[PDB]
Amino acid sequence: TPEEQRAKNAKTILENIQIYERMCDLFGVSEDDKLIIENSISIERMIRVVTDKKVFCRLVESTAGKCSARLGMALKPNVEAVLTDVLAVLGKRMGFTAMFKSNLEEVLYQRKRNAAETFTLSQGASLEARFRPIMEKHLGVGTVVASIKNILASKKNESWSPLEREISFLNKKLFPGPMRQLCKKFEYLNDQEKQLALNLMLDASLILKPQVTHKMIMPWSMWLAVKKYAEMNKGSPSLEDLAAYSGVRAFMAFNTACYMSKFTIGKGIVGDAEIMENGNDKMQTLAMACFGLAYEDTGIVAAMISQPMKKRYQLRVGNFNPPEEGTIKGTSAGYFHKWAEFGNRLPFNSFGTGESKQISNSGVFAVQRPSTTNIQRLAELMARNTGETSDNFTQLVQKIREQVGTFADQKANLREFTGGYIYDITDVTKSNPKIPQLGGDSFFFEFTGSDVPRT
């Protein structure tokens, strides 16, 4: 039952709000300043540092109508004591905080062992090693490949080894076909053959899209803002009503959090330390971080938000650390006027209504007609159905190139997430599907003439 899962989420969310508020108290954050997102980022960072098997924390304080950085200090036992009073499961909840931090850094910075152009496949790249197994489904192909490369580099200087676990993770994500067969021989390949297999599977995934799990992960501060709004506005949805990490209720949760949430505007953006931050640009950065939208088609995002969509280097945004001096600004409520489901399966597969199994016609009448076969679906079928087992490493490499080629040759007609639509935020029943008008540059990290000087 959906309500069963929301009740479970509300329990976890209420625990996180309790931890956040009590930790803020322990570090001397006023009740009003608990709603500043910078403080949530810093508090969550401190918990992750302390709980990794006498504590200072950089924080924002509101003063004289402005904001200023202060260094909060607590006894390490008191931090642990607050956690004990409220509370594997801790790993998951902190795994999520790390994932939001990774998704924020993906928007802010493009950032080793993988080619620069594969960076849009590096979801979860900021996660520390301890959180990677827990958040495995959220990690991109590039992130797992980098971990595999790290293991291999560590070797050159148990029934389930870390490398074997990582390979199993990659196999599940990869587009079906010869890439999955190549994973099965990874242990039998030499070091150079391993490097080639990894870079080939990574390059091919830039068109043969992998399956990656997406959730709406926002800072604890914003969940606190949902709770306070729910208590203050009686006709409003409850926290359990909004205790969803996907679907329309997640968008309602984010928009509701934006009524009371706060962030800081200061001197210094990423790139130039002398340029002033802009409120709307920081709002867009916050929205993109909470939904992991850095690598998403900007046209899709632009069709759903209440402000003009901007490319990365047109945004005057800082690092979300507490500024030494600045102004506090409220988040914008109603930022998302349209919503959509997450695509957590292979993008070339169907999602929703457009999921019939008919991909061809068999003619009956001798009537001239065009061929109607869905070439994309046929190519996917043959990837799953016509695999040769006697293929060696060289042969698998070749069919991976050929698999990339057949979809590249079809690029103009390739469709991802067929049957998926955007819906108005009021349209919770999904009764009126809409299709965004896409076109033009869809890359968030494109350089433009409207970019910020020095950035």
How far apart are alpha carbons 97 and 87 in whole angstroms? 17
If the CB atoms of residues 159 and 362 are measured against a second copy, the closer one turns out to be 362
Q: How far is the CB of 336 from Cl ion (least distance, A)?
A: 16
396 counts as binding a second copy under rule CB under 8 A:
no
12 binds, among a second copy, Cl ion, none (CB under 5 to 8 A by kind): none
186 counts as binding a second copy under rule CB under 8 A:
no
How far apart are alpha carbons 432 and 369 in whole angstroms? 33
How far apart are alpha carbons 167 and 169 in whole angstroms? 5
Q: Which among 423, 374, 52, 83 is positioned nearest to 250, based on CA atoms?
A: 423
308 counts as binding Cl ion under rule CB under 5 A:
no
Question: What phi and psi values does residue 434 have, to the nearest 5 degrees?
Answer: -130, 150
1 counts as binding Cl ion under rule CB under 5 A:
no
437 counts as binding a second copy under rule CB under 8 A:
no
Q: What are the structure tokens assigned to 108, written together? A: 């802010």
Neighbours of 246 (CB within 10 A): 14
If the CB atoms of residues 57 and 243 are measured against Cl ion, the closer one turns out to be 243
78 counts as binding a second copy under rule CB under 8 A:
no
Q: Restricting to residues 140-159, which ones interact with a second copy according to CB under 8 A?
A: 140
Contact criterion met (CB below 8 Å) for 305 and 276: no
Q: How far is the CB of 246 from Cl ion (least distance, A)?
A: 7
Q: Which amino acid is at 83?
A: L
89 binds, among a second copy, Cl ion, none (CB under 5 to 8 A by kind): none
16 binds, among a second copy, Cl ion, none (CB under 5 to 8 A by kind): none
169 counts as binding a second copy under rule CB under 8 A:
no
2 binds, among Cl ion, a second copy, none (CB under 5 to 8 A by kind): Cl ion
Q: Restricting to residues 102-141, which ones interact with a second copy according to CB under 8 A?
A: 110, 115-121, 123, 140
Q: 284-287: which pairs have CB atoms within 8 A and are 24 or more residues apart?
A: 284/309, 284/310, 284/315, 285/104, 285/107, 285/108, 285/315, 285/317, 285/320, 286/37, 286/331, 287/254, 287/335, 287/336
Q: Are strands 325-330 and 66-74 parallel, antiparallel or unpaired?
A: antiparallel
214 counts as binding a second copy under rule CB under 8 A:
yes
Q: After which residues is the chain discontinuous, taking C to N > 2.5 Å?
A: 53, 87, 111, 157
Interaction pattern, residues 236-255, with Cl ion; x per rule: CB under 5 A: --------x-----------
Q: What are the structure tokens assigned to 419, written together? A: 């049957």
- State which of residues 375, 424, 428, 455 lies at the interface with a second copy (CB under 8 A): 375
- State which of residues 159, 368, 429, 437 lies at the interface with a second copy (CB under 8 A): 368
How many residues does the structure list for the chain?
455
Q: Restricting to residues 332-351, which ones interact with a second copy according to CB under 8 A?
A: 340-343, 347, 351
327 sits in which H/E element: strand 325-330
244 binds, among a second copy, Cl ion, none (CB under 5 to 8 A by kind): Cl ion
235 counts as binding Cl ion under rule CB under 5 A:
no
How far apart are alpha carbons 105 and 95 in whole angstroms? 15
226 sits in which H/E element: helix 220-232
454 counts as binding a second copy under rule CB under 8 A:
no
How far apart are alpha carbons 131 and 437 in whole angstroms? 38
121 binds, among Cl ion, a second copy, none (CB under 5 to 8 A by kind): a second copy
Angle between helices 220-232 and 248-257 (to 10 degrees): 80
Q: How far is the CB of 60 from Cl ion (least distance, A)?
A: 33
- State which of residues 168, 184, 447, 454 lies at the interface with a second copy (CB under 8 A): 447
Tokens 């899209």 belong to residue:
209
100 counts as binding a second copy under rule CB under 8 A:
no
Q: How far is the CB of 247 from Cl ion (least distance, A)?
A: 5
If the CB atoms of residues 71 and 153 are measured against a second copy, the closer one turns out to be 153
Q: Restricting to residues 10-69, which ones interact with a second copy according to CB under 8 A?
A: none
If the CB atoms of residues 234 and 369 are measured against a second copy, the closer one turns out to be 369
If the CB atoms of residues 10 and 57 are measured against Cl ion, the closer one turns out to be 10
110 binds, among a second copy, Cl ion, none (CB under 5 to 8 A by kind): a second copy
Q: Restricting to residues 239-298, which ones interact with a second copy according to CB under 8 A?
A: 291-293, 295-297
Q: How far is the CB of 371 from a second copy (least distance, A)?
A: 4
Q: Which amino acid is at 337?
A: H
218 counts as binding Cl ion under rule CB under 5 A:
no
How far apart are alpha carbons 353 and 417 in whole angstroms? 11
Q: Where do contacts with Cl ion occur on this chain (CB under 5 A)?
A: 2, 244
